[PDB]
Amino acid sequence: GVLTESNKKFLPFQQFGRDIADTTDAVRILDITPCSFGGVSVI
Amino acid sequence: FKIYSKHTPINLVRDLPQGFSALEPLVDLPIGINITRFQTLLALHRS
Numbered sequence: 001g002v003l004t005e006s007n008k009k010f011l012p013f014q015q016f017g018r019d020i021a022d023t024t025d026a027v028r029i030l031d032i033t034p035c036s037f038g039g040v041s042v043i
Numbered sequence: 044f045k046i047y048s049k050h051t052p053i054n055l056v057r058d059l060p061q062g063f064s065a066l067e068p069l070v071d072l073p074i075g076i077n078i079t080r081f082q083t084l085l086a087l088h089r090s
């Protein structure tokens with residue numbers, strides 16, 4: 001994924017940060033943003 | 044052995060403060076001992 005500067009505040013005892021679906025969102029602080037992906041259609 | 048801690052200012056006289064206050068972890072000591080009873084320690088006053 002892509003490491004991004006995070007505006008979220010992490011407590012000193014917190015290492016990882018998970019959003020909905022219990023998937024990794026931020027890691028000690030850098031936000032994880034999966035790089036661009038999608039579908040491809042042919043007309 | 045896990046200690047979670049929190050501190051708060053209260054303005055009652057003799058009661059248990061109501062409301063909600065989450066306690067953040069303080070320490071996680073890797074000791075691993077058998078504990079079944081405990082006692083508190085308090086300091087007295089002399090003059």
Ligand SMILES: *[C@@H]1O[C@H](CO)[C@@H](O[C@@H]2O[C@H](CO)[C@@H](O)[C@H](O)[C@H]2NC(C)=O)[C@H](O)[C@H]1NC(C)=O
Nearest residue numbers: 044045072073074075076077078079080081082
């Ligand atoms: C911690 O120590 C206590 C002793 O006060 C243990 O309690 C006894 O355990 C034995 C088994 O080893 C039993 O036969 C006794 O009946 C228990 N007595 C009581 C009052 O509970 C306890 O098992 C120990 N715990 C660990 C994890 O070792």
